[PDB]
Amino acid sequence: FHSGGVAECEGCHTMHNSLGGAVMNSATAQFTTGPMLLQGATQSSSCLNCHQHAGDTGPSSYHISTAEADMPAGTAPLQMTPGGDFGWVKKTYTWNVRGLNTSEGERKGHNIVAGDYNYVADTTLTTAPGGTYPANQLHCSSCHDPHGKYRRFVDGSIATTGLPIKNSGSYQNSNDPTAWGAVGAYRILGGTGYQPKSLSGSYAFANQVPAAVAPSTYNRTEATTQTRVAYGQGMSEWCANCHTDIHNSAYPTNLRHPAGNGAKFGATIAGLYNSYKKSGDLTGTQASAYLSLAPFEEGTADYTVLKGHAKIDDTALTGADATSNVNCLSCHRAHASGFDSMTRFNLAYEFTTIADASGNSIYGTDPNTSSLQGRSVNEMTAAYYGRTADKFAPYQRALCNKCHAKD
Amino acid sequence: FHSGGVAECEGCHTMHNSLGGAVMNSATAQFTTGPMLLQGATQSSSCLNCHQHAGDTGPSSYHISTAEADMPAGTAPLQMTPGGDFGWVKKTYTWNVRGLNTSEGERKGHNIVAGDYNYVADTTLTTAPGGTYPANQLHCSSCHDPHGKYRRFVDGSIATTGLPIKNSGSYQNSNDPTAWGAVGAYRILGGTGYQPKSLSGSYAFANQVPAAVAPSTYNRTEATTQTRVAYGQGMSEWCANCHTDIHNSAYPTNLRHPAGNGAKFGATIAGLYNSYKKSGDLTGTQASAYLSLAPFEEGTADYTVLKGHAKIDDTALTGADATSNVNCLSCHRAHASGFDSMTRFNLAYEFTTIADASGNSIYGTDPNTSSLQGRSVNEMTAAYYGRTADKFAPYQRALCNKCHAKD
Ligand code: HEC
Ligand code: HEC
Ligand code: HEC
Ligand code: HEC
Ligand code: HEC
Ligand code: HEC
Ligand code: HEC
Ligand code: HEC
Ligand code: HEC
Ligand code: HEC
Ligand code: HEC
Ligand code: HEC
Ligand SMILES: [Mg+2]
Ligand SMILES: [Mg+2]
Numbered sequence: 001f002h003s004g005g006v007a008e009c010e011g012c013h014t015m016h017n018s019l020g021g022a023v024m025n026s027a028t029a030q031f032t033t034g035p036m037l038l039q040g041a042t043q044s045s046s047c048l049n050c051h052q053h054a055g056d057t058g059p060s061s062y063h064i065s066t067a068e069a070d071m072p073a074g075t076a077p078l079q080m081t082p083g084g085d086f087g088w089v090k091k092t093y094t095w096n097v098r099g100l101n102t103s104e105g106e107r108k109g110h111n112i113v114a115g116d117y118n119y120v121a122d123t124t125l126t127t128a129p130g131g132t133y134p135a136n137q138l139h140c141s142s143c144h145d146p147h148g149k150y151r152r153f154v155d156g157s158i159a160t161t162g163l164p165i166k167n168s169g170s171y172q173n174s175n176d177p178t179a180w181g182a183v184g185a186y187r188i189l190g191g192t193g194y195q196p197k198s199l200s201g202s203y204a205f206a207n208q209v210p211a212a213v214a215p216s217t218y219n220r221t222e223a224t225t226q227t228r229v230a231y232g233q234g235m236s237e238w239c240a241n242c243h244t245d246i247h248n249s250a251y252p253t254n255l256r257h258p259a260g261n262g263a264k265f266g267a268t269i270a271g272l273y274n275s276y277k278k279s280g281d282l283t284g285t286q287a288s289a290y291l292s293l294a295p296f297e298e299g300t301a302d303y304t305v306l307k308g309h310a311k312i313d314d315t316a317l318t319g320a321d322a323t324s325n326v327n328c329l330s331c332h333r334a335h336a337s338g339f340d341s342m343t344r345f346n347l348a349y350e351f352t353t354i355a356d357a358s359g360n361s362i363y364g365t366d367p368n369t370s371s372l373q374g375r376s377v378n379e380m381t382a383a384y385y386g387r388t389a390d391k392f393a394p395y396q397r398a399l400c401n402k403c404h405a406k407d
Numbered sequence: 408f409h410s411g412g413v414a415e416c417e418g419c420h421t422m423h424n425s426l427g428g429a430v431m432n433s434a435t436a437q438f439t440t441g442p443m444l445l446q447g448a449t450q451s452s453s454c455l456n457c458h459q460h461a462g463d464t465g466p467s468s469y470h471i472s473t474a475e476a477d478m479p480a481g482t483a484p485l486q487m488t489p490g491g492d493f494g495w496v497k498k499t500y501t502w503n504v505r506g507l508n509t510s511e512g513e514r515k516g517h518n519i520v521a522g523d524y525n526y527v528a529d530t531t532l533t534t535a536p537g538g539t540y541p542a543n544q545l546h547c548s549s550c551h552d553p554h555g556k557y558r559r560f561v562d563g564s565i566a567t568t569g570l571p572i573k574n575s576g577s578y579q580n581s582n583d584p585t586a587w588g589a590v591g592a593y594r595i596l597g598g599t600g601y602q603p604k605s606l607s608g609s610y611a612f613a614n615q616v617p618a619a620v621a622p623s624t625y626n627r628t629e630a631t632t633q634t635r636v637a638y639g640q641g642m643s644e645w646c647a648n649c650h651t652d653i654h655n656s657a658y659p660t661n662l663r664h665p666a667g668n669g670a671k672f673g674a675t676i677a678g679l680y681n682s683y684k685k686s687g688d689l690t691g692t693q694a695s696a697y698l699s700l701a702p703f704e705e706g707t708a709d710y711t712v713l714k715g716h717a718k719i720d721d722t723a724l725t726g727a728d729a730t731s732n733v734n735c736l737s738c739h740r741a742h743a744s745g746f747d748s749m750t751r752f753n754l755a756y757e758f759t760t761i762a763d764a765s766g767n768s769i770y771g772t773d774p775n776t777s778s779l780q781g782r783s784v785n786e787m788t789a790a791y792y793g794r795t796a797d798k799f800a801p802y803q804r805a806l807c808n809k810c811h812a813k814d
Contacts, residue, residue: 107427129425130438245438246423255440257422280571280588331422341426347417350410355573359587393571395588397413406413406554407568 004184005148005165012046012146013037025049027116036198041116043198044139048114059219064335068118076338076382081219082229084109084335084342090118091338095367095374103348103373109336112138130243133203142199145190150209151182156301158191158208171216172310176303185209189238203242210235211301215312222385226290228317230310231297235327236260246328259328261299267322269403274319276405279393289319292385293344294402297325338375338383345399346383348373355394363389411591412555412572419453419553420444432456434523443605448523450605451546455521466626471742475525483745483789488626489636491516491742491749497525498745502774502781510755510780516743519545537650540610549606552597557616558589563708565598565615578623579717583710592616596645610649617642618708622719629792633697635724637717638704642734643667653735666735668706674729676810681726683812686800696726699792700751701809704732745782745790752806753790755780762801770796 001007016031017023017039023030025039033039040046052065059079065086066078077087089111093103106122113121113136121136128135149160152169154177162182168174169183177183185191191209211232220227236259240247248254249262265273273296275284298320300306309316332342339346346352349370353361363380364371372380381388401407408414423438424430424446430437432446440446447453459472466486472493473485484494496518500510513529520528520543528543535542556567559576561584569589575581576590584590592598598616618639627634643666647654655661656669672680680703682691705727707713716723739749746753753759756777760768770787771778779787788795808814 124427129423129427246425255435255442255444256424256438257444280569282568347415350408350412350414355588393588395571395573397572398416400416401413407556407571 002146002148002168002184002188003165004151004168004170004188006146012039014039042114042139043141043196044112045114045116047140048117052117059221061217061219064219074376074379076379078382079219080221080382080385081335082214082227082333084333084337086112086119086336088336088338093374095369095372097370101370101373103340107340107342108338109333109342110138111135112140128242130240130246131203133242134201137199139196141196143189145188145194148184148188149194150185150188150191152185152303153177153182154179156303158185160191160193170212171214172307173216186212186214205241207237207241208234210238211303211306213303213307213310215310217312220312222292222387225312225314226292226387227312227385228291228310229295230306231295231327231329232301232303232306233261233297233299233325234301235297235329236325239328259326261297261325263326265296265320265322265324265326270320270322270324272405273403276401276403276407278391279396279401279407281393282405286317286319288317290317291319294330294399296320296330297327299323299325338380347398347400351395351397352399353389353392353394353396359394361389361392361394361396409553409555409575409591409595410572411558411575411577411595413553419446421446449521449546450548450603451519452521452523454547455524459524466628468624468626471626481783481786483786485789486626487628487789487792488742489621489634489740491740491744493519493526493743495743495745500781502776502779504777508777508780510747514747514749515745516740516749517545518542519547535649537647537653538610540649541608544606546603548603550596552595552601555591555595556601557592557595557598559592559710560584560589561586563710565592567598567600577619578621579714580623593619593621612648614644614648615641617645618710618713620710620714620717622717624719627719629699629794632719632721633699633794634719634792635698635717636702637713638702638734638736639708639710639713640668640704640706640732641708642704642736643732646735666733668704668732670733672703672727672729672731672733677727677729677731679812680810683808683810683814685798686803686808686814688800689812693724693726695724697724698726701737701806703727703737704734706730706732745787754805754807758802758804759806760796760799760801760803766801768796768799768801768803 014024014033015037017033018030027041034041035043038046040049048065051063052067053063056066056070056078064079064081064083068090071077071087077085079085086109088108090105092105095101111122112119125135150158151165152158164181165184166181167183170186186209189209190205192206193204195204211234213230215227236247247260248256248258249260251258274286274289275282277283298306331344333344336342351371354364354371356362363377367374367376397407421431421440422444424435424440425437434448441448442450445453447456455472458470459474460470463473463477463485471486471488471490475497478484478494484492486492493516495515497512499512502508518529519526532542557565558572559565571588572591573588574590577593593616596616597612599613600611602611618641620637622634643654654667655663655665656667658665681693681696682689684690705713738751740751743749758778761771761778763769770784774781774783804814
């Protein structure tokens, strides 16, 4: 459909609303339409018209959102992709230990306003923490550019026009560009100057489409072999478009956790990322040092050698060295997650995995404790991308430690 | 929170400073941070963010520091723990007898530099009396290791890595370690080689985490039944890390009051510790010989038999014999105290308790005398851990005597 580019216009727009018979979108009458000529209540209900299937059982290809009629109450959104499953946003949690703890739902992930569904805009965060981009006009089309303009040529340069598009250009199978026509950026997400014309003001991107390269069957479980998404450069400067203060290359001067291309890894830190495999253990051997749950940039726009990585079978795990950068995604997840500020690990209560009664870990077994924070065991097995509580020590502690071996 | 280990990283660090809304620590702007990525003006204002409650009435669980807005002027810090209540440091005293006596405030206890509060570093003592560790970089994190590395296994060995942590390991309730994962050292205070990387120089610990075992409701009054903290071995060699000359095992050769594991108690001295209960009286009977105000080591790392002691009801008082050692704490108190060089008893003026007008003792009744040295009666009832002037004879003299029966 979007083959790196402007798909099929009618797939998202009706020029009238009569496809023979009667209307094409059941959110209006015969001859009216959505805000633009597209077909939905809002500019972001047109993508949920195909990326939210009706009755799913397990994670499939795309379909990064699972319905709420499906996950009855005490279950977990079923779409294990590297961005996340928006199903999370509508998931509140309560539990008592010595008071009334309550992890809200609208703090896990970006809220898109899809009033056609039960998607509401955020309340607490009226704007974006960094710069000021407004948070009631947060549609899929804000980060993603539906009419894929931004192209990668063969010299590696990026522009918004000049030759035809031929393919996605965002996989391992994706046939590299040639002298006659380019391919499309990592996801169709928009590069420099991509203000959507519906929005009106001064908010206009400034940094380029990042560099990265997905596996090509990116939506999977991770109990067995784990998914590895590659990460070229620029991936932080890009979120920097709508968060600005939070970017930080030089750490000591700017007191905030380093993130960017100007934030190298450290020869020492790097030694540690390998050594620390589990919690209490520091064996090492790069060949095994994973890349899922706390990944890292390679800092190299060479789509040939970096496509080198990005397999979906645990062959190239291949930790890092003091050249590797650390983008915002090494802690967070772009779409959403199960953890209060859309992180990848847990950071709410001292441990993550309790020791059952003997040894071998388990996430815990009582939904009104602090080990689980009101999240039944299946839930929190899906909060991580379906990896059992057996890839962690009986009393696994917090999980920055994959870098900072504070064990 | 610190369950023997690395608690909850975010509890002490912000990676940015925006927890939704606005900032998390009100000591900086939106997207800046403390010296390390933690949240406070200094590396030791992060622990006072939870161990100094706002308005307290009486001593509670932890909270070893009571605010100054609370104790108006003529009152006493309200935290009766076995380390002490830092509230003392900011307490000067004046009185006249035949001149102008003035017991300063910054001599009672270690000064931590918490510029975020009214905590200033020491002036008179620019370094530490023993070796040279500098006394403007004296943070809670200097003696205490926030990322609890040091573990006790089941063989009793101590290391800084190798198995997971499961619990504090520093109480009577604390479930002993097992073959799969260890517990944490007596307090999280750091063992061998624990230089904090902020500090830069040669100052690097050399001796191990001591051995001791607290009661498990350690913060209490003592008017009624008295708190007994147990004391394994090594407790002096440990303060020896930052004071070195002052350690002394063999007395006659090294002329300074004996202190350590190589400093036994004496069959004669030991006979005396029991006999002398009050000042003028020498009844004896070990079963009653206390252990609070002048305690002593047992010299035994056997966490089972030494946990045997350490109750908080006056059952095991159980004086000693010529094997018992004498650590630095048998005279001093680790955090602070009300007595000029942070001791446990008074050693300023001949007596401690005057005889009122009839007999039964009282600390005295006139704040400009020498009996009180400018410390109103309530004050000096809290200088001792709330024990009235009725556990002492009408004219109680100095208080080394619990060992040296110089009465
Ligand atoms: C509305 C604006 C959106 C947005 C923001 C995205 N989609 Fe689609 N999508 C569909 C299919 C079949 C695919 C796979 C086939 C193909 O891409 O040609 C995709 C893929 C994507 C991607 C990744 C593609 C890439 O190469 O980078 C992204 C980032 C994406 N989508 C976002 C199917 C549909 C639809 C079915 C008709 C509709 C409608 C949309 N998508 C709309 C959107
Ligand atoms: C096929 C060639 C077309 C053509 C001719 C157009 N589109 Fe679409 N379009 C989509 C969305 C979500 C928007 C909203 C953008 C926003 O909110 O800012 C639009 C917008 C337009 C416009 C107005 C804005 C502009 O910059 O031009 C126009 C003139 C336009 N489109 C024409 C979504 C989609 C699709 C979803 C996958 C697809 C396919 C297309 N558009 C294709 C076309
Ligand atoms: C690039 C991949 C990123 C990353 C890693 C994050 N963002 Fe966004 N963001 C935007 C708005 C309006 C908000 C407030 C809206 C809301 O709260 O739903 C946010 C918020 C966040 C958070 C906190 C989310 C929360 O629920 O509290 C986080 C952790 C986060 N962001 C990470 C708007 C935008 C953008 C506008 C175009 C862009 C681009 C990004 N964000 C990009 C990213
Ligand atoms: C999870 C919540 C955390 C937390 C609390 C911290 N980290 Fe890291 N970080 C990484 C690198 C390479 C650095 C280098 C800083 C430098 O060496 O100049 C940092 C920086 C820090 C600091 C600075 C402390 C210092 O000694 O300067 C602190 C306090 C800190 N972080 C806390 C890299 C990583 C990771 C790589 C994948 C991960 C994961 C984390 N950090 C996670 C966290
Ligand atoms: C900053 C570095 C510090 C330091 C040096 C200490 N704390 Fe805490 N503390 C908190 C709570 C609830 C407890 C009891 C619960 C538990 O320990 O799990 C403690 C306990 C301690 C101890 C004794 C613990 C032991 O088992 O030995 C010590 C030595 C100690 N603290 C020192 C609460 C907090 C906080 C609340 C968020 C914060 C922040 C800190 N403490 C920070 C520190
Ligand atoms: C959770 C797993 C983490 C991680 C990943 C880190 N910390 Fe902290 N930390 C605290 C304090 C007071 C300091 C200052 C130490 C000093 O002054 O020397 C630090 C320091 C760090 C660093 C830099 C120093 C180092 O040796 O690494 C790093 C990389 C780091 N931390 C990561 C205080 C605390 C806490 C207070 C109770 C808690 C909880 C954590 N840290 C947890 C973590
Ligand atoms: C282990 C439990 C001990 C004991 C029993 C004492 N210390 Fe310390 N000490 C350090 C520094 C820099 C000073 C000077 C700073 C200051 O004066 O505030 C001190 C001072 C003392 C004193 C005199 C205190 C006073 O106010 O005059 C006493 C009685 C004392 N110490 C006892 C530094 C350190 C350490 C650095 C890591 C460590 C460990 C200790 N001291 C340990 C202990
Ligand atoms: C409070 C200020 C004091 C003072 C001034 C003294 N003591 Fe004691 N000390 C203890 C033990 C077991 C010894 C053995 C020395 C030995 O027998 O070899 C000592 C040593 C001394 C001496 C040496 C005098 C001598 O005859 O060799 C002196 C002069 C001295 N101390 C003074 C044990 C204790 C305690 C056990 C809990 C306490 C309390 C004190 N001493 C307190 C003090
Ligand atoms: C001016 C008044 C008209 C009239 C009378 C019609 N057209 Fe359009 N139209 C366009 C496209 C792409 C379609 C079909 C696909 C789709 O909407 O997704 C249509 C459809 C119609 C119909 C079909 C009725 C039905 O099948 O339900 C009819 C009768 C019709 N039109 C008449 C596109 C355009 C267009 C630009 C692309 C313009 C300009 C017009 N239409 C104008 C008219
Ligand atoms: C609104 C409902 C949507 C829809 C349909 C999609 N997005 Fe996004 N998204 C963003 C980024 C940076 C990525 C790539 C990040 C990564 O690969 O880790 C994605 C990813 C996707 C995909 C495929 C990849 C995947 O799901 O892992 C798809 C199909 C997709 N998106 C569609 C960024 C944002 C964003 C803010 C930055 C917002 C809002 C959305 N996406 C919303 C939507
Ligand atoms: C690179 C520029 C970024 C950007 C744009 C964001 N992150 Fe982080 N961040 C981390 C953690 C644990 C939290 C929440 C909990 C806490 O701070 O105690 C956050 C928070 C955010 C927000 C929240 C704003 C708010 O809620 O007030 C936003 C918008 C945000 N981040 C964006 C952790 C990390 C991290 C390592 C753990 C790295 C690396 C980054 N962040 C990088 C970025
Ligand atoms: C700075 C503000 C702090 C904070 C928050 C704490 N400490 Fe210490 N402390 C030291 C030692 C040896 C002990 C144990 C001594 C004993 O048990 O007698 C303690 C004790 C504590 C506790 C609990 C036990 C208690 O309070 O009695 C807590 C919660 C605690 N500390 C926190 C040693 C030092 C030290 C120099 C050696 C310094 C400086 C601090 N502590 C400072 C702080
Ligand atoms: Mg939100
Ligand atoms: Mg002092």
